[PDB]
């Protein structure tokens, strides 16, 4: 088996075991410069050659065992990169292995890191980095065989100007000044459990910590530091109930990285310090699910990970499902239900947007010629979730599948599974129950287009309130605006607020007067909870109020969590009034945006 997504040498040849890093961050030139020491170990005998993965990596040299070995690079094959074919000197055998040292240098334009003047961080006196290798970008910041399906410690040691701090998807093991007597510190990084690349991240500028648990540090820069430690409190606590839920943390620390404003994600689940947007900080914790939903990652991805990324599904259908536990047992079954019902309507929104029919929609893809980035959407998340929710019911209920969930992560643990591991490992554990398992119509959860064969049962305690309501709104006509008024909200919570906008924007556009009316009785441009504030725009917009245009225009801009800016800008750009200014505010916004997501947005408004 083979990962499409790559251009080196597959497990089935070699694998890499070990990663020492050394390197310098360079913040003139915009580049990190160092050696890679990976080492391999052979899966077949006279192995006399491996191909790493690479992105515009400039290869300085390629040492092995003191000297200097030939290599070659191919042919770049768009968004993959090129391929790099090292040459052994002495042939390998079977699981005999060896040490390679590549000095490279990170191109400018690394589509895995973006860097920030210091005008573009908090602090305006000092610059910033961050690295987002996840999907397949982490070829772009060092050679590698850039997929899923290998699995490697990894120590390092990087120099810094000292007045800045460098974090690691590791434990931190110290700082000491660079050995070439520059103004720099060299802090140093160490990984003891097996991890796919992507999970390797790095993070420079001039961060701050605060410590809100045990092995909790919340790292921000000093004007954020505050209002995260108090986002983020109960992240202890749900790190409790994931330990009962999946088994034993291993990691050691937990410490989250809350980054600028231009993180693509709202999560990432950098091993040992998780990093999420500052879009989170709504100041009443209302956001702290995707803390659940990263936390839940140490068990379903990290330490289970998927084999290629057709089987993306693995990882956050899973996650998503002990997110939802997670909240679950914290706030209660009805509002675990209530969260499952609002995923399903998300899934209801991707499937309508991409087209029933669309290769997107199904659970497992095929990412052959298919740009990971392009295909990313909440299909994986909540269809994912759909069909472990469904066989929960089918199966017997949370307790009986929670037992499966926590097996499921024993047996794989430190291993990259396929979607047949999974399944064929679910029947092995429901052995008692195969019968109900073929009730269950795997061809079309697993593989057909569009919305799943079959809805789960949701409780509506917590819903009923928002279809009311929405439900009010979008048959709403003259005579009913005067009776809308702001105890309409009154008992609403801030996540059923959301959900009612959710609703409501399923059916836009509303009619311009009867959104302004909105705007009069509830006040939501008020509102600056990052979820509740996206759909109140969107919802604004599409129903034509020009008045919308610049706040819309700004959300989009100072902020570049992806969820938001593209469904945004694409909005805008429907908008014949606001169609020009979006395409101008794209256009001079890209030089400053994150890679990544500069180039989504240019596809989603089809400039250049
Ligand atoms: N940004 C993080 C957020 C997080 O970790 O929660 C992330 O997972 N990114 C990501 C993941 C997979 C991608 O490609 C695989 C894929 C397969 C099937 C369908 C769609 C995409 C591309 C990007
Ligand atoms: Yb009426
Ligand atoms: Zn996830």
């Given at each position: 088996?083979?990962?499409?997504?790559?251009?080196?040498?597959?497990?089935?040849?070699?694998?890499?075991?070990?990663?020492?890093?050394?390197?310098?961050?360079?913040?003139?030139?915009?580049?990190?410069?160092?050696?890679?020491?990976?080492?391999?170990?052979?899966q077949?005998?006279?192995?006399?050659?491996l191909?790493?993965?690479?992105?515009?990596?400039?290869?300085?040299?390629?040492?092995?065992?003191?000297?200097?070995?030939?290599?070659?690079?191919?042919?770049?094959?768009?968004?993959?990169?090129?391929?790099?074919?090292?040459?052994?000197?002495?042939?390998?055998?079977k699981?005999?292995?060896?040490?390679?040292?590549?000095?490279?240098?990170?191109?400018?334009?690394?589509?895995?890191?973006?860097?920030?003047?210091?005008?573009?961080?908090?602090?305006?006196?000092?610059?910033?980095?961050?690295?987002?290798?996840?999907?397949?970008?982490?070829?772009?910041?060092?050679?590698?065989?850039?997929?899923?399906?290998?699995?490697?410690?990894?120590?390092?040691?990087?120099?810094?100007?000292?007045?800045?701090?460098?974090?690691?998807?590791?434990?931190?093991?110290?700082?000491?000044?660079?050995?070439?007597?520059?103004?720099?510190?060299?802090?140093?990084?160490?990984?003891?459990?097996?991890?796919?690349?992507?999970?390797?991240?790095?993070?420079?500028?001039?961060?701050?910590?605060?410590?809100?648990?045990?092995?909790?540090?919340?790292?921000?820069?000093?004007?954020?530091?505050?209002?995260?430690?108090?986002?983020?409190?109960?992240?202890?606590?749900?790190?409790?109930?994931?330990?009962?839920?999946?088994?034993?943390?291993?990691?050691?620390?937990?410490?989250?990285?809350?980054?600028?404003?231009?993180?693509?994600?709202?999560?990432?689940?950098?091993?040992?310090?998780?990093?999420?947007?500052?879009?989170?900080?709504?100041?009443?914790?209302?956001?702290?699910?995707?803390?659940?939903?990263?936390?839940?990652?140490?068990?379903?991805?990290?330490?289970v990970?998927?084999?290629?990324?057709?089987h993306?599904?693995?990882?956050?259908?899973?996650?998503?499902?002990?997110?939802?536990?997670?909240?679950?047992?914290?706030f209660?079954?009805?509002?675990?239900?209530?969260?499952?019902?609002?995923?399903?309507?998300?899934?209801?929104?991707?499937?309508?947007?991409?087209?029933?029919?669309?290769?997107?929609?199904?659970?497992?893809?095929?990412?052959?010629?298919?740009?990971?980035?392009?295909?990313?959407?909440?299909?994986?998340?909540?269809?994912?979730?759909?069909?472990?929710?469904?066989?929960?019911?089918?199966?017997?209920?949370?307790?009986?599948?929670?037992?499966?969930?926590?097996?499921?992560?024993?047996?794989?643990?430190?291993?990259?599974?396929?979607?047949?591991?999974?399944?064929?490992?679910?029947?092995?554990?429901?052995?008692?129950?195969?019968?109900?398992?073929?009730?269950?119509?795997?061809?079309?959860?697993?593989?057909?287009?569009?919305?799943?064969?079959?809805?789960?049962?949701?409780?509506?305690?917590?819903?009923?309130?928002?279809?009311?309501?929405?439900?009010?709104?979008?048959?709403?006509?003259?005579?009913?605006?005067?009776?809308?008024?702001?105890?309409?909200?009154?008992?609403?919570?801030?996540?059923?607020l959301?959900?009612?906008?959710?609703?409501?924007?399923?059916?836009?556009?509303?009619?311009?007067?009867?959104?302004?009316?909105?705007?009069?009785v509830?006040?939501?441009?008020?509102?600056?909870?990052?979820?509740?504030?996206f759909?109140?725009?969107?919802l604004?917009?599409?129903?034509?109020w020009?008045?919308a245009?610049?706040?819309?225009?700004?959300?989009?801009?100072?902020?570049?969590?992806?969820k938001?800016?593209?469904?945004?800008?694409?909005?805008?750009?429907?908008?014949?009034?606001?169609?020009?200014?979006?395409?101008?505010?794209?256009?001079?916004?890209?030089?400053?945006?994150?890679?990544?997501?500069?180039?989504?947005?240019?596809?989603?408004?089809?400039?250049?």
């Amino acid at each position: 088996i083979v990962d499409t997504c790559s251009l080196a040498s597959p497990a089935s040849v070699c694998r890499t075991k070990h990663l020492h890093l050394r390197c310098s961050v360079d913040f003139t030139r915009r580049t990190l410069t160092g050696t890679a020491a990976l080492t391999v170990q052979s899966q077949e005998d006279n192995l006399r050659s491996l191909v790493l993965d690479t992105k515009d990596l400039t290869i300085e040299k390629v040492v092995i065992n003191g000297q200097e070995v030939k290599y070659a690079l191919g042919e770049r094959q768009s968004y993959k990169g090129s391929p790099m074919e090292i040459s052994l000197p002495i042939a390998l055998s079977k699981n005999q292995e060896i040490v390679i040292e590549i000095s490279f240098e990170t191109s400018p334009k690394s589509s895995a890191l973006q860097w920030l003047t210091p005008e573009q961080t908090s602090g305006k006196e000092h610059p910033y980095l961050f690295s987002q290798c996840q999907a397949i970008h982490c070829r772009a910041i060092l050679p590698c065989q850039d997929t899923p399906s290998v699995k490697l410690t990894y120590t390092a040691e990087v120099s810094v100007p000292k007045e800045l701090v460098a974090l690691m998807s590791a434990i931190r093991d110290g700082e000491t000044p660079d050995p070439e007597d520059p103004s720099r510190k060299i802090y140093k990084f160490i990984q003891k459990v097996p991890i796919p690349c992507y999970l390797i991240a790095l993070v420079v500028g001039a961060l701050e910590s605060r410590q809100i648990g045990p092995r909790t540090l919340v790292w921000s820069e000093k004007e954020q530091v505050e209002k995260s430690a108090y986002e983020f409190s109960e992240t202890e606590s749900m790190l409790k109930i994931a330990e009962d839920l999946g088994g034993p943390y291993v990691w050691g620390q937990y410490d989250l990285l809350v980054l600028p404003p231009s993180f693509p994600y709202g999560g990432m689940e950098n091993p040992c310090l998780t990093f999420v947007t500052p879009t989170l900080l709504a100041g009443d914790k209302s956001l702290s699910n995707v803390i659940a939903h990263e936390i839940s990652h140490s068990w379903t991805g990290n330490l289970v990970t998927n084999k290629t990324w057709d089987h993306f599904w693995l990882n956050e259908g899973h996650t998503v499902y002990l997110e939802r536990h997670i909240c679950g047992r914290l706030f209660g079954e009805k509002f675990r239900h209530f969260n499952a019902l609002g995923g399903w309507g998300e899934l209801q929104n991707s499937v309508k947007t991409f087209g029933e029919t669309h290769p997107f929609t199904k659970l497992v893809v095929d990412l052959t010629d298919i740009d990971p980035d392009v295909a990313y959407s909440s299909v994986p998340y909540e269809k994912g979730f759909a069909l472990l929710f469904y066989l929960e019911q089918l199966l017997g209920g949370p307790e009986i599948f929670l037992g499966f969930l926590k097996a499921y992560v024993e047996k794989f643990s430190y291993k990259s599974i396929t979607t047949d591991d999974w399944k064929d490992f679910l029947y092995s554990y429901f052995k008692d129950k195969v019968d109900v398992l073929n009730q269950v119509d795997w061809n079309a959860w697993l593989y057909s287009p569009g919305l799943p064969p079959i809805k789960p049962n949701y409780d509506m305690t917590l819903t009923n309130a928002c279809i009311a309501l929405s439900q009010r709104w979008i048959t709403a006509k003259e005579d009913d605006l005067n009776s809308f008024n702001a105890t309409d909200l009154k008992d609403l919570s801030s996540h059923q607020l959301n959900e009612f906008l959710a609703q409501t924007l399923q059916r836009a556009p509303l009619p311009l007067g009867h959104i302004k009316r909105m705007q009069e009785v509830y006040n939501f441009n008020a509102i600056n909870n990052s979820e509740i504030r996206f759909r109140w725009l969107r919802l604004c917009i599409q129903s034509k109020w020009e008045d919308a245009i610049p706040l819309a225009l700004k959300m989009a801009t100072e902020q570049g969590r992806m969820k938001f800016t593209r469904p945004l800008f694409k909005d805008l750009a429907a908008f014949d009034k606001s169609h020009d200014q979006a395409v101008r505010t794209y256009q001079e916004h890209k030089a400053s945006m994150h890679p990544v997501t500069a180039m989504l947005v240019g596809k989603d408004l089809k400039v250049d």
